[PDB]
């Protein structure tokens, strides 16, 4: 059971949307978690249970997707919303997670 | 502990005050099935066993 | 919540460190914790579990035999232990929660800070 | 009505609507059928006073 | 009761129990119609006698 993130660096400007994906090697449910890690902090996590955010996250991050296919959806952030992404899972022992994916503009 | 499915536990029901609310918005639960009777009404009607 | 981990440095190869987190808020009891190391310049990969008493601990790749976590809730801490080290394993190190025993638990998650650990 | 809501009490209620009418059309037949028995025996009255 | 297990072999005998009933129905209604019209023939034959 191993996360992977397949989209590479991308280059969105401040604006428009970015949708990022996230698999997995077998059939995980409502148990994916999402982290944003900037240059040398700590992974601030992101959505509960792949549907509800957690406090301090605004509105505009929004979690979805099922079955082994999971997506990140960013529908207009700002001016300085661009790091590291990661998914993670608590099915099973241990939490994998995964690769992770930058952006750059 | 719980038991095993070959020999499952069974525990009866006396005079009481049963509640069903609490129970049911603790948001925990992987299946909250009611079939013959709604999840709000436990509330309010009384039973025999 | 809150979680607060100390222990770090420099080191040698082949000694010992007290990788210890505190915690307090929430109940450390009823409630499973991990480890978790980042070498500066990677992602992130997990080390090992403890499972709310210690019965059931399990281990990461090469890191089975050099590391031994243990929890104590009657002084609501943990530990890794760290011991005869390599130097290919400086990295930072985070203690978080897996989450949930009972059915009244109410799963939240919370990470640490971290802790770095230097060898020579 | 008190165990079950709107979406699934109406399955149940329609099936005692459906009986209970046709229970009350059947009684209506026999009282028409009846009624016209005893109009001849009073048309047979009236013509023997 | 052959191709059907008990949980879906009662839906499809109350279709059969139905269609039956309302046609044993309108056979019982029909007669009682027919009768009634026998009845007043008679009555005419008994007084023609």
């Known amino acids: 059971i191993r996360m992977t993130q397949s989209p590479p660096t991308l280059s969105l400007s401040p604006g428009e949307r970015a949708t990022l994906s996230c698999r997995a090697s077998?059939?995980?449910?409502?148990?994916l978690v999402w982290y944003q890690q900037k240059p040398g902090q700590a992974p601030r996590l992101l959505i509960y249970?792949?549907?509800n955010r957690a406090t301090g996250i605004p509105a505009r991050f929004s979690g979805s997707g099922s079955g082994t296919d999971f997506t990140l959806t960013i529908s207009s952030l700002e001016p300085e919303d661009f790091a590291v992404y990661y998914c993670?899972?608590?099915?099973?022992?241990?939490?994998?997670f995964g690769q992770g994916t930058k952006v750059d503009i | 502990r719980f038991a095993s499915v070959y020999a499952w536990n069974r525990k009866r029901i006396s005079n009481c005050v049963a509640d069903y609310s609490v129970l049911y918005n603790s948001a925990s639960f992987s299946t909250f099935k009611c079939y013959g009777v709604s999840p709000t009404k436990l509330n309010d009607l009384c039973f025999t066993n | 919540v809150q979680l607060v981990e100390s222990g770090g440095g420099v080191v040698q190869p082949g000694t010992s460190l007290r990788l210890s987190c505190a915690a307090s808020?929430?109940?450390?009891?009823?409630?499973?914790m991990y480890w978790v190391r980042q070498a500066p310049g990677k992602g992130l990969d997990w080390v090992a579990i403890?499972?709310?008493?210690?019965?059931?601990?399990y281990y990461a790749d090469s890191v089975k035999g050099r590391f031994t976590i243990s929890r104590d809730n009657s002084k609501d801490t943990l530990y890794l232990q760290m011991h005869s080290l390599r130097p290919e394993d400086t990295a930072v190190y985070y203690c978080?929660?897996?989450?949930?025993?009972?059915?009244?638990?109410?799963?939240?998650?919370?990470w640490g800070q971290g802790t770095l650990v230097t060898v020579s | 009505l008190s165990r079950l809501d709107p979406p699934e009490a109406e399955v149940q209620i329609d099936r005692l609507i459906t009986g209970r009418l046709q229970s009350l059309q059947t009684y209506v037949t026999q009282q028409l059928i009846r009624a016209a028995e005893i109009r001849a025996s009073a048309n047979l009255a009236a013509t023997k006073m | 009761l052959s191709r059907l297990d008990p949980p879906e072999a009662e839906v499809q005998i109350d279709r059969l129990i139905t269609g039956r009933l309302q046609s044993l129905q309108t056979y019982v209604t029909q007669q009682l119609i027919r009768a009634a019209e026998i009845r007043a023939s008679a009555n005419l034959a008994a007084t023609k006698m």
């Open positions: 978080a929660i897996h989450g949930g025993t009972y059915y009244y638990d109410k799963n939240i998650l919370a």
């Open positions: 808020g929430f109940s450390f009891s009823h409630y499973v």
């Open positions: 403890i499972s709310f008493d210690g019965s059931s601990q």
């Open positions: 077998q059939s995980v449910t409502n148990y």
């Open positions: 249970d792949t549907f």
């Open positions: 993670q899972q608590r099915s099973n022992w241990p939490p994998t």
